[PDB]
Structure formats: C-alpha cells, structure tokens
C-alpha cells in the first residue's frame, strides 16, 4: 500500500507516478461567528464526481516530481499557482494498475490561497477534468454529523481520503 | 420529503420558515476528452455542512415574495454576477416540507456566458468560505466503466431533497 520515496523512486518503467498537493492556509474566520474554521484547505470535484486533490500525472518530459507537480497545478488551478512552488520539503507520502501516488502539502497565506480560488475558473481544465474547488470543513456541527464527518462520507478518489486524514492528524486536528 | 402545492405552501402560518433554492443551468456543447458530451453546465455547491446542494437560503417576512428572497440569497451566495438575471415565478419548480420548514425549488435557464461569470465571481460572494465552500458543476454523463460521472456524483452527501430536485430537473430536461 504505502512506501518510501526512495523505494518508489526506485522502480522499473512498469510504474508511472502521480503528484497531488493539499494547499492550506490559516483562517481566523468563524462560521456563523461562533465556529472556528482554523484552516482553509482546497480539494477539487473531479470529472468522475469524486473528491480529490489538484495535480496529475508526471511524464518523461519532467526534470523531477516537483516540476511535474507544479506544472500540473498551473494547468489545473491557473496563474495564481505560479505565486508559489511546491518543493521536496512539502512531500508527505507515497502510495500504491501500477501507479505510485505522491502526496504533498504546502502552507499558503490565506491571501495566496484566495487568489488560487479566484482564478481557478480560467484554468485550462476548468469545466472539464475539474468541476470546481471546495474547501474542507474542519469542524463538526452541533448535531455531531454536519461538517467534516459528513464531508468524509462523500466519494473520494484513490487514497485522497486517507491523505486528507493523515494531514489533518499532522496539523493537530485529529 | 412530503410535497406541497405553491398556493397551500404560501397559505401556511407565521410559524414556518421558508427556504428557496435555484438550479442554474446553461446549455454546453463541449466534450470531456473531446469524445463525451457535457450537454449543460449545471451549478451546485458544497455547503458548510459538507453536503452538496443548490444556491439559496432563508426567506422571511422581510421579503416582498419568495422570488425577491431567492434573488437576495443568490446574491449573498454567488455574488454580483447573479444580479444580471432574475429567477422569477415562471422558473419555479416545486415545494417540499421536518421542523416546519418549507423548501422551494427553482430552475432557471442562463446563457453559457452568464453561467461562467457566476463561477468566475463566486469567490467574492459574502457566503464564500462560510456557508459556501465552493461551486461545482454536475457531471451529467456516465463514464465507460458505468459508475464514474453522474452516478458517483449521486453517491455524495446531499442536503434535504436536492438529489431528488436535481434528478427531477434532469428528467424534465429529457435525460433518460
Ligand atoms: Cl522522473
Ligand atoms: Cl411572474
């Protein structure tokens, strides 16, 4: 299932790689003035009706995983994604058809993150591979179901659900 | 989700909340992977509660009609761009009733250019990042595996009867 980046960097041509990024930004915002949002975190509704992360396939044209991640993101998200670069320091995990899924996480400013939302419609893949961007609600509502717990009952691509949870875990959100 | 006629629903007493939601759609000729027809761009939204639904909201006695209230909530939910059309009584579709809420549904044909400006602008709506977590188009196809596209979309969590309201409008749009 899961493996080391070197372990997977080491692999024959019978494997290709994908790169995906969880973009996040602190948020002092408060739903209804009462419920702290904590962080804005983007996901995308994909062409198959499943929730996933931005990025995509890295191919022989790329000098590295990050060059392919950042290229995929310019195309999926638009020009606001070139305000920053995802680097190896933002890498998190690799997972295994015959595909290795690399996963990254990049802290943005709320301002940067908002610019990415604002420009996402003009992106090439908008209204095609990507049906739109959504933020992950990080709270649980007063009924004990609304919010994250219900968000987590949606359809997710691949291992995106588990990537999400691990990263939230690692943000101190359980 | 027991149904109501619009007149009856309007007759209901001072102890009911009324909500109004709108399915905004334009025809779209494009093809996914240049081979799979989109047919229409139809807007839905990810709500604060992690459920998919339609733009709209509460309507109160301070609204001179359900329509005025819907256009007001549409402006809150999606921004300036939505002011460029009014959703009127002719676009009305159905009303449903738990806790003395009545929920009214509209469907409104926009021009593809109008629908885009709505998405382009939604990041500036008051509710964006609050009640509205972002917009999404409904995928109307089913993909070669017979599960991706629409039928997987339908397995996501929906608020109220948005699934039913959606499915209803797709049927009335003539989609099998
Ligand atoms: Cl490589
Ligand atoms: Cl009228």
Author numbering:
A (entry chain B): 5 to 100, 104 to 181
B (entry chain A): 4 to 100, 103 to 181
Verbatim from the authors:
A similar cleavage reaction was observed in vitro with other enzymes from diverse organisms, including a snake venom phosphodiesterase (SVP), mammalian ectonucleotide pyrophosphatase/phosphodiesterase 1 (ENPP1), Escherichia coli RppH (EcRppH), and Homo sapiens NudT16 (HsNudT16). In addition, although NudT16 was initially characterized as a nucleolar U8 snoRNA decapping enzyme, it is involved in mRNA decapping and expresses across mouse tissues. Given the versatility in the recognition of substrates with diphosphate bonds, we and others have used some of these Nudix enzymes in vitro for processing ADP-ribosylation to a unique mass tag for site identification by tandem mass spectrometry (MS/MS). In this study, we sought to understand how HsNudT16 binds and hydrolyzes different forms of ADPr using X-ray crystallography.
F36A and F61S mutants were designed to enlarge the mouth of the enzyme with the aim of easing the recognition and processing of the ADPr conjugated to proteins. Modeling a Ser side chain at F61 position suggested that the mutated hydroxymethyl group could potentially come into hydrogen bonding distance to the non-adenosine ribose of the substrate, which may contribute to its orientation for catalysis. H24W and F61S mutants behave as dimers in solution as shown by the size-exclusion chromatography profile similar to HsNudT16. The crystal structures of mutants F36A and F61S show that the replacement of the phenyl side chain of these residues with a methyl or a hydroxymethyl group, respectively, opens up the mouth of the enzyme. The structural overlap of the HsNudT16-ADPr complex structure with the HsNudT16 F61S structure shows that the serine side chain opens the mouth only by about 1 Å. On the other hand, though the F61S mutant does not change significantly the width of the protein mouth, the activity towards free ADPr is decreased, suggesting that Van der Waals interactions between the phenylalanine side chain and the ribose reduce the possible conformational changes of the bound ligand and thus facilitate ADPr binding. Crystallization was successful for the H24W, F36A, and F61S mutants and the structures helped rationalized the effects of our single-point mutations. Despite co-crystallization efforts with ADPr, electron density for the substrate could not be seen in the binding site of these mutants. Compared with the wild-type, HsNudT16 mutants Δ17, F36A, and F61S have reduced hydrolysis activity towards free ADPr, comparable processing ability for MARylated proteins, and improved catalytic efficiency for PARylated proteins.
